[model samples]
Structures are given as structure tokens and as C-alpha cells.
Target: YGRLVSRAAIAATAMASLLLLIKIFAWWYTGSVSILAALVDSLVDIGASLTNLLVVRYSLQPADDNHSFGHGKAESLAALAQSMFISGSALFLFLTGIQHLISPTPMTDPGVGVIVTIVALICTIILVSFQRWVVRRTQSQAVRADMLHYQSDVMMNGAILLALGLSWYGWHRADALFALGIGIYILYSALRMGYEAVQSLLDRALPDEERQEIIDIVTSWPGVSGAHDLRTRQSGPTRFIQIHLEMEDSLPLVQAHMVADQVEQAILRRFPGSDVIIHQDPCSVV
Candidate 1:
């Protein structure tokens, strides 16, 4: 679903554009702090989605003369950028919340902005759900971060609605309260996404379950007495895995080669696009 990830990115970009306009229109029409905050968020989300759109496109390119590992890590690089942008916006939100809470003011004419926000938020869910579905199809961290970024909009938008209604009814501090909370939420999300992307950039090992999974596949195979050195790391969307297979010493060299080949193929079947390497080890039958 690499192809699917790009499509979701495009849709998110398109949704942010529409939602931004919707929020901006409402903000201007009613001059609500709630709507204005949402508008700024969409501004960050717009760029966030566009970056993934371009990054995924670049990441999927055919391996070039320079990048033998394929142009996959493009996803991680852009994912790192995504986290930075999210945190930058989070700080802006944090400061705004502080400023407002320091000197509270009731929103003026928030009447119709509520209507527009409700409609725009409906669209937010549509796009957010679609992005999650895309992520399920292909577990790409780059695209997954994009999905998380967009999903946060759902919560942010909901908070705006509550804030707008309360502030409209003369509960002035409610808007500032929600804004501060949302900033905290954004900062944490940004940190997690950035950390995941860096793990790939740093070539961290695959999950313990996955490591055990490979071991299970090799050790259970016919004629394989043991397995070891199951090293694994992820780069971009590709997982690189290595294993050393042991067989009976009496087995001829050709049979050992066949055993190694069969295990590699089995690993490939389970891992799909993963890169698998297998080495031979002959165990003496005492």
C-alpha cells in the first residue's frame, strides 16, 4: 500500500486546504478565538500533509545509482520534518493559550462560526478515517506520522467547538483552557512521532516479536537443526533481516545450500518486502 499511502496524503492535503478556508471564513465572519486557533492548526497541517505527499512520492522511486537500498528512507527524513513542524506549531499554540488566559476576553459574534466549524469538522473525520485505513494497509512510519498528525485535528476541532460554545455563552476562560490542553497534546504526539522516525534513521532493530517470528520460521523448517544471528533493522519501508541456519553435518553441501535457500524463501513469504539473508552452519551429530 505504498501507492495507497500517497493517495491518502493527497486527500489529507486537499482536506486541510478546504478546512483552512472554512475556519478562516468563520474566524473572519465572527472573530472567534476558537476558530482562529483552529485556522492556525490547519495551516500547519496543510504543510504537514503536503510534505508527506512529496516525500512518499520520492521514497517510492526506483533505486538509483547512488542509493542501493532504494530511495525508501525519504519517508523517515520527511517524518522527522513533520515532527519538527508539529512541535513548532505546538509552541505557538502554547504561547497563545498563555496570552489569552492571562487576559481573558469573551469571543465576539461566534454565532455562525459554530455552524461552519461543525461542517468542516465533519470533513476532518472523513479524511482522518481514510488515512488510518491507508496506514493499516501499509505500515509505513512516515505515512503513519502523517495519519497521527491529521487525527489530532479531530480532537483539536472538537475542543474548538466546546470552547466556542462556552466562550460564546460568557465562559471566557474555557477557550484558553482548551487551547493550553491541546498544545500539551500536540507536543507529546510530536515527540513520539519524531522518536519513531529517528529509530529508523538510526537503524533500530525490529520488534522482539518479529525477531522471534523469524527464528520460529527457520528453526521449524525441515533438516534445520538450529538457527542464530537473526539480526534485523528497518530503513524506510524495508526491513533487512539476517539469519544463520544450522543443519546436520552429514548433509552434503548441496543439501545445506537447499536448506538455506528454502529458509530464505520462507522468511520472504512471511515478511513480504523484507530483505532476508541466510548463512549455513553445519552441526556435528555426536
Candidate 2:
């Protein structure tokens, strides 16, 4: 799965590079604001994808003395950086788009622009499909974020096609409007990425249903009276769970240790790639 994740990141970087070059040429040849918007997006995507590749590689490394919890948070850091890049580009594009809308300019080579965008759409579709596969196998935040970026590219390319068609038909303002819309959507995506990354960095608890499921599993163990303090948090792809299990006060210490070990193993089996800690508490008589 790690190898597959790396392959996906590389593929995304390659695709972003290809699209950036083509879009740059397309924008230069046609002077379409929509093409310009797509160009800037691909430019930012190149940086973001490259960052993912590097950070994911580092994040997968084994834990060392200085970093006991491992390098998992590098994925979240990469995501936050990617969001910053995307948001900055989106803001610039939005301002430029508005200016173009105010003073519309006739677009030349609309056919070339449309053809280029069609190619970009095809490339984005392929990249996105591969990213989805990586996410399913790895549950990697970096790859997931990259997938979202390319998914938006799919929409941006389609919108560019529409803008080109509209501009060809004397509705020049349509191109600016479409560019502005793409910019706004890109900004929204950036905000979402930032929020998800921040949540992971802050060690936010797992979803309610997932946490409840963990509690239920712990309590269902034989000889376990109840479960409490079943805390759950996530960092990158790893879930951290800590819980206290109530046990019979008369039980021997060795027996309690065995039961705790069994319960922890059960949880690890249920939730792979998780770090679990179980504390056994002797129960009081009623």
C-alpha cells in the first residue's frame, strides 16, 4: 500500500506537470481567462503533488527517539501547505477574473483552447481514478487531498470548455464569469483541506459512531464489567485509543493482565493500524 501510494503521488505530479505545461501554452495561444485559471491551478497542483510525494515518503518512516509517535503528522502538514498554495492561487485568479469581467476582451483561438481543455479533462479523470484507488488501499490523507484537487480540476477543465464555447459565440463575459466561479470553488476546496488537516494535527477524536463502536467492543469482552475513558483520536492514518476496563476485584493480577492483553489484541484485530492502550480497573462490590 505504501508503494502504491508513492506511485499515485508520482503519477499525480507527472500529470500536474503535463497539464501545467499544456495549459500555459493554451493560455498563451488563446489569451482565455478560463485557460489562465486552469493554468494557475495546475501550477499549484504540481507543487502540492510534489510535496505529497516527499512528505508521504518521510511520514512512512519508522519512529525514532526524537519522534516517538512516528512521522504520521507529516501528511497533515503537507495537506496544510497544499491548501495554502491553492488558496493563494485562487485569490489571485479571482481578482484577475473580476478585472477581466469588468473589461472583457475578445478571445482568439477558441478552438485551440477548447481542445486543450478537453485533453486536460481526460488527464484529470485518469489521475483522479488512480488516486481513488490509492486512497482505498492506503487511507492516506495526502493522496486523498490530491484526489480532491484533481477532482476539482475535472470541473475546472469542463468549465473552461464551456467558457471557450461561450466566448466563441460573442459572449466574451462568459469566460470571465466562468473563471471567477472556478476560483471560488477552488477557494472552497482549499478551506476544506485546511480544516481537515488542522483537525488531524489537533488530535481530534474519531467520529461518534466509531468511538461508540470501540466502547461497545471493549465492554463485550468476557469478565469485563464495563468500559470507561474509551478515548479515541486520530493522527494521519493512525488511530490512538486508550480505555479503562472494569474487572472483578477478586481476579488475580496475572489473570487481569491476560484479559487486558486479550482485549487489546481484539481491538487491534478490529482496527488495524491503530495504537491501543488498555488499563484494567478492579470493580467494587455493590
lDDT of each: 0.51, 0.51
Q: Candidate 2: where is the Cα deviation over 4 Å?
A: 1-46, 88-92, 99-102, 105-124, 154-188, 235-247, 269-275, 283-286
lDDT of 2 by residue, 1-286 (tens): 2345433344334334433443333333235443433345545555655555555656555666375556556666666655655552444454434233423444432333433434434554665675556564545654355455555555543344454443244344345445643555456556656766776555556667656766677767773564545555543232222223333554445555656666666665333444466655655433
Candidate 2, poorest ten consecutive residues by summed lDDT:
236-245
Once model 1 is optimally superposed onto the true structure by TM-score, how far is the C-alpha of residue 134 displaced, in angstroms?
A: 1.6
TM-score of each: 0.66, 0.67
- Model 1 C-alpha lDDT per residue in residues 1-286, reported as the tens digit of each score: 2245433344334323333343333233236444433355544555655555555656555667375446556666666655656552554554444234423444443333434444445455665565556554554543444555555545543345454443245343345445643564456445655666676554566677656776777777774565546666653222222223333554455655656677777666442434466556554423
How good is model 2 by TM-score?
A: 0.67
Q: Count the backbone clashes (under 3 Å) in each candidate.
A: 0, 0
C-alpha RMSD values across all candidates: 6.2, 6.3
lDDT value for candidate 2?
A: 0.51
